[PDB]
């Protein structure tokens, strides 16, 4: 009863999407 | 660069020699990096057209400038990416994982990360188009090392993509369809594909304990337990996340993490200068003393008290509040000897020294601690001890002080703890 699942905000993730420069 | 208008003027002339110069020049604009114009490529009506190009099997080079072109307006915002799905090309991007060219199958797969990585919903969507099973088949041979690198890298972010978000979670068919392929990368020796398979392992261990289960069934903790270890931080910090993940599971979960010697990697990760792996590190060592007392003994035995104890004494204020919950937990499971050892080791002080902070909920979860502590106290009979102890190093001023605390927890346990022990 004492497990805590992972919280996380927007800020500190980071992005899921990645465009191709070259 | 071409300008937009010439752009359109190209795509629209029915000349396929004229269209593929102008999608390259399309190509190139939404490559560049500052402010590629996405919106005024959509406003102009050239997805469709793209999507189209896509199609051109006798055409291999619009194929790929189409899909170069979508997979940047792809990579933008939510909308950006709505227009791209809008358009018609997740079938499109499908077929061409088909495509006998490496590069035109790399560059669908690159694409349908973007949409799959938008949110739960394309991620859905593109499962439902019948992704999987093409994407799996590009994986399949025998010994990963013969494919290109990049290639192997953008697969595995692509599939780390269909492993990520909630609400909802991705089906648990398509988890199992992708599970034996991520394990598999997850065993490859290139530190982009380790970094991309251990934060899809950590995705799909971020939920229920069933879907931890799903995963640890299949034998990854000693994999994860060596990934901790290794020198590169991208590594290092999801292999952390997915071990920390899992010992928020099942105390039967918890064991194969302890098992498989991961409490052996936490001096190091308990010290480690990156703060968020401190942090990290020291949530994970939280939930695992919320475990059985056997498990706290075993954080015993690896000697990860005194590390605790410094955590608490000097780090980032955030992972000093995991430091906290890790003791409170500790002292809530562990047995009087285990507690005693606790006081043995020094954390009375820094415990104290944190009833200083401006933030409620650590100053409830010390008041806890305290209690706990006091109630090991009371059956060894030496309460006065350690009210003796907390008053030395200054405890029992800050504690008369939150009596006049605003928060009713706070106010209430430090007023029981005056009366009964001081």
Not at chain 2, 54 to 59: A, E, Q, R
Not at chain 2, 139 to 164: E, F, I, K, M
Not at chain 2, 171 to 179: C, G, H, K, R
Not at chain 2, 313 to 330: P, V
Request: net charge negative; charged share 20%; glycine share 6%.
């Amino acid at each position: 009863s004492g497990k805590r699942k992972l919280i996380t905000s927007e800020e500190e993730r980071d992005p899921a999407k990645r465009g191709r420069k070259s | 660069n071409w300008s937009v208008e010439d752009i359109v003027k190209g795509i629209n002339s029915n000349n396929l020699e004229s269209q593929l110069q102008a999608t390259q020049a399309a190509r190139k604009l939404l490559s560049r990096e500052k402010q590629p114009p996405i919106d005024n490529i959509i406003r102009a009506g050239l997805i469709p057209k793209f999507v189209s190009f896509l199609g051109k099997t006798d055409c291999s080079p619009i194929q790929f400038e189409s899909a170069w072109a979508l997979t940047n307006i792809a990579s933008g915002t939510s909308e950006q990416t709505k227009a791209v799905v809008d358009g018609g090309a997740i079938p499109a991007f499908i077929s061409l994982l088909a495509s006998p060219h490496a590069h035109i199958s790399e560059q669908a797969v690159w694409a349908l990360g973007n949409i799959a990585g938008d949110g739960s919903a394309f991620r859905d969507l593109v499962i439902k188009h019948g992704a999987i099973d093409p994407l799996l088949a590009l994986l399949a041979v025998p010994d990963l090392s013969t494919l290109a690198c990049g290639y192997l890298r953008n697969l595995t972010w692509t599939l780390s993509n269909l492993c990520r978000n909630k609400n909802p979670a991705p089906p648990l068919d398509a988890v199992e369809q992708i599970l034996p392929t991520l394990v598999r990368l997850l065993h490859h020796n290139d530190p982009e594909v380790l970094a991309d398979s251990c934060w899809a392992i950590s995705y799909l261990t971020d939920g229920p304990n069933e879907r931890i289960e799903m995963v640890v069934k299949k034998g990854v903790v000693p994999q994860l337990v060596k990934l901790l270890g290794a020198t590169e931080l991208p590594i290092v910090t999801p292999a952390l996340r997915a071990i920390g993940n899992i010992v928020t599971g099942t105390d039967e979960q918890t064991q194969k993490v302890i098992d498989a010697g991961a409490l052996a990697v936490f001096p190091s990760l308990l010290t480690n200068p990156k703060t968020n792996i401190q942090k990290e590190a020291t949530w994970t060592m939280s939930n695992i003393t919320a475990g059985r007392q056997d498990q706290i003994q075993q954080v015993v035995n690896h000697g990860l008290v005194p590390f605790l104890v410094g955590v608490l004494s000097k780090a980032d204020f955030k992972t000093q509040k995991e430091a906290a919950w890790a003791i409170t937990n500790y002292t809530s499971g562990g047995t009087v000897e285990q507690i005693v050892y606790l006081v043995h080791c020094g954390i009375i002080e820094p415990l104290m020294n944190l009833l200083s902070a401006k933030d409620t909920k650590i100053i409830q979860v010390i008041l806890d601690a305290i209690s706990n502590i006091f109630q090991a106290a009371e059956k060894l009979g030496e309460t006065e001890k350690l009210s003796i102890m907390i008053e030395e190093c200054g405890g029992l001023d800050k504690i008369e002080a939150l009596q006049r605390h605003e928060n009713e927890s706070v106010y209430k346990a430090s007023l029981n703890l005056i009366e009964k022990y001081f």
